[PDB]
């Protein structure tokens, strides 16, 4: 708006930017030339503003589509994919109004401190009778071949049950165990 209203004070190579001043100072055959220069300048400014509004309309439409996608993905539901709803693993999102737009508040997870540990593809008994695999977790060992279960995003080991363990097809890459087998494998 400031650039739109600041083109009224541009002389555009004329004696003055006031049409009344040109009318008073100058004769007719030069009056038409000076007013023609003024008209050229003002119409160029108006067309520039029209093109500016038309360009910004496309960006506003694309941003409207993006806001619709973010509301229908991260707000009403928990997004499986990461990075589309802020940094980290998404928990919840609140949408609020903003000046000429929308303000989004994404609450990530962001793990802080990590532990280096080892795990296998799955646990199977003896001659590959029936094998299991982790469901939203990993298999951990205390150090005496005592396999336990841990979460995929927090370290607090718990004994393996049939509820966090899912049966899987036997392979060759699994780890075979002999003693102190978990109750799903018994």
């Amino acid at each position: 708006l400031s650039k739109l209203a600041s083109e009224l004070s541009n002389t555009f190579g004329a004696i003055s930017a006031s049409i009344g001043d040109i009318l008073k100072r100058l004769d007719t055959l030069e009056q038409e030339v000076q007013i023609d220069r003024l008209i050229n300048g003002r119409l160029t400014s108006l067309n520039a503003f029209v093109s500016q509004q038309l360009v910004r309309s496309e960006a506003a439409a694309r941003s409207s589509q993006l806001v619709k996608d973010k509301v229908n993905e991260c707000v009403k539901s928990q997004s499986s994919r990461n990075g589309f709803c802020g940094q980290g693993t998404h928990i919840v999102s609140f949408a609020v109004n903003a000046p000429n737009g929308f303000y989004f508040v994404h609450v990530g997870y962001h793990p802080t401190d990590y532990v280096n540990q080892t795990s296998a593809y799955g646990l199977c008994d003896s001659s590959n009778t029936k094998c299991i695999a982790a469901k939203n977790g990993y298999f951990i060992k205390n150090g005496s071949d005592d396999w336990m279960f841990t979460g995929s995003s927090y370290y607090q080991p718990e004994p393996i049950t049939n509820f966090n363990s899912r049966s899987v097809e036997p392979e060759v890459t699994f780890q075979n165990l002999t003693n102190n087998l978990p109750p799903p494998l018994s």
Binding site: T112, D113, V115
Partner: peptide
């Protein structure tokens, strides 16, 4: 596997 965490609030304006 992580052992500690803290929330990070992400603010986006569109």
């Amino acid at each position: 596997v992580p052992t500690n965490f803290s929330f990070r609030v992400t603010e986006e304006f569109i």
